[PDB]
């Protein structure tokens, strides 16, 4: 059969990567943004748009190419896509040059062993055909201008980029399958070309998978066990080994060490500089210059399949082929990271460094930063000296100052979208490992925002913020953590500059919140502000937070919105709040799944803590009973509460009498919110009962969506005519009628009203009403209106 012979041929091609593939292969961890490899293309939901558009993301050396070759070999061995698919094809960006227009026939002929495939027979059922695009970072060189060029003929010879762009949007063989493996850097535009794709990220080895990989690498079990033990000797190296490429490099280095008699613990002692130490252990200035210039010209030209002319220009000769390079004549680097490393080393042995600084972005997915990363690696004073004394060369030093200036350029720029993320900057600053320069070039980050998804991220963040000395606002993202939280927040207590800490929407969980709590109550921490919205906490964290409040006198405000604390959680918090050393001022408790029962406890807080100015207990099933319980204790003039809020509390007019008492008595209760409460006109009249009081101080009174009516409208007129202190108001979603609006207008006309804002959003008024509102805006422009819906 044709499929059997083609599968045998691709098995022959993909048997090795030399070194055998499957024997050295080890499983990886992948999660859809764990998704099993055998569970790839079936739709989890029965209404999935074509499953044929799946995109893959991963780091450099994560195993996208190895995953592609492994799935191809499985399809060549009778494992996967036998009863489901029939044909699998391989397309590579490096081989498919964008300058030469081609067709799908060319790709099939290249993939087929026979230069004369049955093209007529194999282009009838695209369902059982899957096209693979590996290394997508070499395709969008002209997608930004070729949006409208569409080709749908399989036999038509059109530029490779245009043809693949046509393939992506499912119009050339629309029912065929596609599998694209990409770097995650520059997907922002590609998702526009994608028709309901599935983004799957690759995370690499776990601990057991790492041990399996060392077993499958070394031919000696004892040597593999010693390598494993020395990997756990260095925690940093063990964390770095989640990338299979680093495992390969360290295994080869340990092989070279033990065969030559060198000790293996030296490899473990070497951190963050695996590539440089590996190169030094493996091993002339003309050779280095030629190879470095070859890598640099490949960088500019996006060329990997070098020919003789490049080596002629760079002075490289036939005797200049080594292990890093590979001859196929075709010259190609074994893995790209090596050529970025050589290009980075070039600029320290066009030599103008500014090409790296500003010509970034000309290549999709940012080849340069990785390059520049090793630049920060090499410019390290100890590493620079070691490079000079190991290769007898000299390293330029103005490059460090230029890179510093680039650091401030990146930090202080405005159009921050095009630049790569700040986590890349922190990777660089961890790579270089120069304390004074890190501190000096890092004092330019008053506000730090980072999103963490692996052990390496946690380690680099720990180092970076530990180096920080002048940071004020800090945010974190645990995008998937007791050990993680400990490792990060241990340094935060020692940080004497931090003042605001954002952790909203992170599912750090309850034990992580506990870890944060014992981190905070250390006397060194200077955090005055802590936001914890939607953290997924519960009543357990309230005990720890209460301890923090009773022990810390620097914290000012605090947020706990949308955590199911409950009335028991509030009961736990009030113990800390009532403590005489609590300096809390603003306390959010929105949507904390509360009930009226907690309200009583809250009352004691208002008579035990005087620093609490504004409370926000909206969106809870408090009710009239709870509001009355709060108000009854709140009527004391000594109570210092200012800006209470009861948004969507399900109240009624019953609590309005208590609110009236509060307004009549308290002299500091300025603001007040009541939206989404069925107060009614009786409730508004009851509020008016206290609003007219000469001792009132209410400086705003929101009533949006209170389900009001025009019966208490005279009360509105009275409030405006007599309240000389109220300066804002809201009436959204209240059917008051045209007569009420015009009476409001005529009341506002006089100079005795000091109102400075009013909203009539979202209702249908009249033409006469609109004229009256325009007039009142005309003669008095200070009194703003938002009447327009």
Give the containing element (helix H, strand E) for 681: helix 680-691
Contact set for a copy of itself, span 708-727 (CB under 8 A) = 714, 727
Stretch that binds ligand 7YN, among 22-30, 126-134, 181-189, 710-718 (CB under 6 A): 181-189
Nearer to ligand ADP by Cβ, of 28 and 274: the residue is: 28
Is 635 marked as a binding-site residue? no
**Binding partner selected for residue 768 from a copy of itself, ligand ADP, ligand 7YN, none, CB under the kind-specific 5 to 8 Å limit:** a copy of itself
The answer to whether residues 503 and 474 touch, using CB atoms and an 8 Å cutoff, is: no
Is 47 marked as a binding-site residue? no
- Site for a copy of itself contains 393 (CB under 8 A): no
Is 60 marked as a binding-site residue? yes
Q: Which position's Cβ is nearest ligand 7YN? A: 59
- The Cβ of residue 615 has, within 10 Å, a number of other Cβ atoms equal to 20
Q: How many residues contact a copy of itself, by CB under 8 A?
A: 20
- Site for ligand ADP contains 169 (CB under 6 A): no
Using alpha carbons, list the distances in angstroms from residue 724 to 685, 720, 728.
18, 8, 11
Residue bearing tokens 């990146």: 410
Per-residue b or e along 304-319, where b marks 16 or more CB atoms closer than 10 Å to that residue's CB: bebeeebbeebebeee
Nearer to ligand ADP by Cβ, of 19 and 580: the residue is: 19
Give which of 601, 510, 518, 519 is closest to 564, Cα–Cα. 510
| Minimum distance of ligand 7YN from residue 679's CB (angstroms) | 36
Handedness of CA 236, 240, 242, 245 (dihedral sign): negative
Is 152 marked as a binding-site residue? no
- Site for ligand 7YN contains 456 (CB under 6 A): yes
* Residue 575-614 contact track with ligand ADP, rule CB under 6 A, x = bound: ----------------------------------------
Stretch that binds ligand ADP, among 24-32, 136-144, 432-440, 601-609 (CB under 6 A): 24-32
- The Cβ of residue 164 has, within 10 Å, a number of other Cβ atoms equal to 26
- The Cβ of residue 481 has, within 10 Å, a number of other Cβ atoms equal to 18
- Site for ligand 7YN contains 66 (CB under 6 A): no
Name residue 478's beta-bridge partners. 452
- Site for a copy of itself contains 754 (CB under 8 A): no
CA 311 – CA 306 distance, rounded (Å): 8
Phi, psi dihedral angles at 701 (to 5 degrees): -150, 90
CA 551 – CA 635 distance, rounded (Å): 30
Per-residue b or e along 718-742, where b marks 16 or more CB atoms closer than 10 Å to that residue's CB: bbbebbeebebbbbbbbebbeebbb
Q: Are strands 129-134 and 177-181 parallel, antiparallel or unpaired?
A: parallel
The answer to whether residues 340 and 314 touch, using CB atoms and an 8 Å cutoff, is: no
Give which of 718, 720, 715, 713 is closest to 753, Cα–Cα. 720
| Minimum distance of ligand ADP from residue 300's CB (angstroms) | 21
* Residue 352-381 contact track with ligand 7YN, rule CB under 6 A, x = bound: ------------------x-----------
Terminal-residue alpha carbon distance, the chain: 70
CA 620 – CA 592 distance, rounded (Å): 7
Of 41, 85, 215, 248, the one binding ligand ADP (CB under 6 A) is 248
Encoded tokens for 133: 């695009």
Of 21, 37, 51, 60, the one binding ligand 7YN (CB under 6 A) is 60
| Minimum distance of ligand ADP from residue 294's CB (angstroms) | 20
Of 61, 197, 566, 623, the one binding ligand ADP (CB under 6 A) is 61
Half-sphere exposure of 598 (CA within 13 A, CB side): 21
| Minimum distance of ligand ADP from residue 622's CB (angstroms) | 55
CA 132 – CA 10 distance, rounded (Å): 14
Nearer to a copy of itself by Cβ, of 546 and 591: the residue is: 591
- Site for a copy of itself contains 759 (CB under 8 A): yes
Is 65 marked as a binding-site residue? yes
CA 324 – CA 333 distance, rounded (Å): 6
**Binding partner selected for residue 559 from ligand ADP, a copy of itself, ligand 7YN, none, CB under the kind-specific 5 to 8 Å limit:** a copy of itself
**Binding partner selected for residue 754 from ligand 7YN, a copy of itself, ligand ADP, none, CB under the kind-specific 5 to 8 Å limit:** none
Binding annotation: 26, 58-66, 335
Q: Which residues bind ligand ADP (CB under 6 A)?
A: 24-26, 28, 58, 60-66, 213, 244-245, 248, 335
Q: Which residues bind ligand 7YN (CB under 6 A)?
A: 59-61, 183-185, 243, 337, 370, 421, 423-424, 456
Q: Which residues bind a copy of itself (CB under 8 A)?
A: 414, 416, 502, 504, 531, 533, 559, 714, 727, 739, 756-757, 759, 761, 767-768, 781-782, 784, 786
Binding annotation for ATP: 26, 58-66, 335
């Amino acid at each position: 059969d044709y499929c059997k012979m083609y599968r045998r041929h691709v098995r022959s091609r993909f048997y090795s990567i030399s070194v055998d593939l499957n024997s050295r292969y080890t499983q990886l961890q992948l999660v859809k943004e764990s998704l099993k490899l055998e569970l790839l293309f079936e739709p989890e939901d029965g209404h999935s748009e074509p499953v044929h558009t799946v995109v893959f993301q991963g780091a450099a050396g994560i195993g996208k190419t190895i995953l592609a070759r492994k799935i191809m070999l499985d399809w060549a061995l009778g494992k996967l896509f036998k009863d489901k698919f029939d044909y699998l094809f391989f397309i590579h960006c490096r081989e498919v040059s964008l300058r030469t227009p081609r067709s799908l026939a060319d790709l099939i002929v290249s993939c087929w062993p026979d230069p004369n495939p049955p093209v007529c027979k194999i282009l009838r059922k695209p369902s059982r055909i899957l096209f693979l695009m590996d290394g997508f970072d070499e395709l969008q060189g002209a997608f930004d201008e070729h949006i409208g060029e569409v080709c749908t003929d399989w036999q038509k010879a059109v530029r490779g980029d245009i043809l693949l762009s046509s393939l992506i949007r499912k119009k050339l063989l629309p029912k065929a399958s596609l599998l694209i493996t990409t770097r995650p850097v520059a997907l922002e535009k590609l998702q526009h070309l994608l028709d309901h794709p599935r983004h799957v990220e690759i995370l690499g080895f776990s601990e057991a998978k790492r041990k399996e990989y060392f077993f499958k690498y070394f031919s000696n079990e004892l040597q593999a066990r010693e390598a494993f033990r020395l990997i756990q000797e260095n925690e940093v190296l063990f964390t770095m080994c989640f990338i299979p490429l680093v495992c390969w490099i360290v295994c080869t280095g340990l092989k070279q060490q033990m065969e030559t008699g060198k000790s293996l613990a030296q490899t473990s002692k070497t951190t963050t500089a695996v590539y440089v130490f590996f190169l030094s252990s493996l091993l002339f200035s003309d050779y280095l210059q030629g190879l470095c210039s070859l890598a640099a010209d490949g960088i500019w030209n996006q060329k990997i399949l070098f020919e003789e002319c490049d080596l002629r220009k760079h002075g490289l000769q036939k005797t200049d082929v080594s292990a890093f390079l590979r001859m196929n004549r075709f010259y190609s680097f074994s893995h790209m990271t090596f050529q970025e490393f050589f290009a980075a080393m070039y600029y320290l042995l066009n030599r103008d460094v500014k090409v790296l600084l500003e010509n970034y972005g000309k290549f999709e997915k940012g080849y340069l930063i990785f390059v520049v990363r090793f630049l920060f690696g090499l410019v390290n004073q100890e590493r620079t000296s070691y490079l000079e004394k190991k290769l007898s060369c000299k390293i330029s030093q103005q490059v460090r100052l230029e890179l510093l200036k680039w650091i401030e350029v990146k930090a202080k720029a405005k159009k921050l979208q095009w630049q790569p993320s700040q986590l890349e900057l922190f990777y660089c600053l961890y790579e270089m490992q120069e304390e004074d320069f890190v501190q000096s070039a890092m004092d330019h980050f008053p506000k730090i925002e980072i999103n963490l998804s692996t052990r390496m991220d946690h380690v680099v963040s720990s180092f970076c913020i530990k180096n920080c000395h002048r940071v004020k606002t800090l945010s974190l993202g645990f995008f998937h953590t007791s050990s993680f939280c400990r490792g990060l927040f241990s340094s935060l207590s020692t940080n004497r500059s931090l003042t605001e800490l954002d952790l909203s929407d992170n599912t750090l969980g309850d034990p992580g919140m506990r870890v944060l709590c014992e981190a905070l109550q250390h006397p060194g921490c200077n955090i005055q502000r802590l936001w914890l919205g939607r953290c997924g906490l519960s009543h357990q964290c309230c005990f720890d937070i209460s301890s923090v409040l009773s022990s810390s006198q620097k914290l000012v405000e605090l947020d706990l919105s949308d955590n199911a604390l409950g009335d028991f959680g509030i009961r736990l918090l009030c113990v800390g709040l009532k403590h005489l050393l609590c300096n809390l001022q603003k306390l959010w408790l929105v949507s904390c799944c509360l009930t009226s029962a907690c309200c009583q406890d809250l009352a004691l807080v208002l008579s035990s803590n005087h620093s609490l100015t504004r409370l926000y207990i909206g969106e809870n099933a408090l009710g009239d009973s709870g509001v009355q319980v709060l108000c009854e204790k709140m009527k004391d003039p000594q109570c210092n509460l200012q800006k209470l809020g009861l948004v969507n509390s399900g109240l009624t007019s019953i609590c309005c009498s208590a609110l009236t008492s509060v307004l009549k008595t308290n002299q500091n209760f300025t603001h007040l919110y009541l939206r989404s409460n069925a107060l009614g006109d009786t409730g508004l009249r009851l509020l008016c009962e206290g609003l007219l009081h000469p001792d009132c101080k209410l400086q705003m009174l929101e009533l949006d969506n209170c389900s009001l009516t025009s019966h208490s409208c005279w009360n509105l007129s009275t409030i405006l005519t007599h309240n000389h202190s109220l300066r804002k108001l809201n009436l959204g979603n209240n059917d008051l009628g045209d007569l009420c609006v015009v009476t409001l207008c005529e009341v506002l006309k006089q100079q005795g009203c000091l109102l400075q804002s009013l909203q009539l959003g979202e209702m249908y008024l009249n033409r006469e009403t609109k004229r009256a509102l325009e007039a009142l805006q005309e003669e008095k422009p200070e009194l703003t209106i938002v009447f327009e819906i």
